[PDB]
């Protein structure tokens, strides 16, 4: 049954102040190992 009448994007009504960073912590294992420049910072 097709619906072109309701706004399906209601998930963002319940987001909190830490939502984005909880999602980043939930994604921190799905990611590739970061490439290195060899040094710890440009002041090292």
């Amino acid at each position: 049954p097709f619906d072109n009448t309701t706004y399906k994007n209601l998930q963002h009504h319940d987001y909190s102040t830490y939502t984005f960073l909880d999602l980043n912590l939930d994604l921190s294992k799905f990611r590739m190992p970061q490439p290195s420049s060899g040094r710890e910072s440009p002041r090292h």
């Binding site: 072109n4 009504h13 830490y18 960073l21 921190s28 970061q34 290195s36 060899g38 910072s41």
Partner: protein, 213 residues
């Protein structure tokens, strides 16, 4: 509204600030999004996280972020004074950001600004005496077809009237949280008088796929 720091009793490097341990987990997760040797790239999300924990940035959050990322404090001070979200003075808990650029001004955001000024009892920049509301006047928030609109700490409240923003401020003073959207009959960005486009159902996967794919 100044871009220097003067040590108050409530803002100094001996003002207490530290992250919760879940914020240290989140900071490690942020730093892992950036390449090795460019740990300094995570100044902005970690300092934003410090604002999300504290509500505002004293000069101990700036120094703590500079300590954990091993950057100079001055390079975090440049960031915290460059951007208009890093609140360097303690704002109220509901931070009403009224947009007043030209697309919101054409649809009478000034009536909303006057309505908030007469509903809260303050003016632009000030804070209400309960320390719940701070009203400032910001630039384009990127909701121009839903003009006029406001932003209250995270959330866009769009297509407003003076009565709609009075009603939203009333249900904020009751301790609840409203629905972050337009307050006219439409939902996000369609024409208000009806759907001039996208009336049909979509075609599904595979429509118009050229030969060789």
């Amino acid at each position: 509204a100044l871009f220097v720091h003067r040590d108050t009793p409530k803002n100094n490097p001996e003002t207490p600030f530290d992250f919760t341990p879940e914020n240290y987990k989140r900071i490690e997760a942020i730093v892992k999004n950036y390449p090795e040797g460019h740990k300094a790239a995570a100044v902005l999300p970690v300092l934003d996280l410090a604002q999300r924990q504290n509500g505002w940035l004293p000069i101990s959050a700036m120094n703590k972020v500079a300590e954990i990322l091993q950057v100079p404090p001055m390079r975090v001070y440049e960031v915290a004074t460059f951007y208009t979200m890093y609140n360097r003075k303690p704002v109220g808990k509901y931070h009403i950001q009224v947009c007043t650029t030209t697309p919101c001004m054409l649809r009478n955001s000034d009536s909303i600004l006057e309505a908030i000024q007469k509903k809260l009892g303050i003016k632009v920049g000030e804070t209400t005496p309960d320390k719940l509301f701070t009203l400032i006047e910001v630039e384009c928030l990127g909701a121009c077809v839903n003009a006029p609109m406001v932003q209250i700490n995270d959330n866009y409240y769009e297509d407003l009237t003076p009565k709609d923003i009075e009603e939203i401020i009333d249900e904020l003073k009751a301790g609840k949280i409203p629905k972050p959207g337009p307050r006219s009959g439409r939902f996000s960005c369609e024409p208000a008088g009806g759907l001039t486009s996208l009336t049909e159902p979509p075609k599904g996967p595979g429509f118009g796929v050229q030969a060789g794919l």
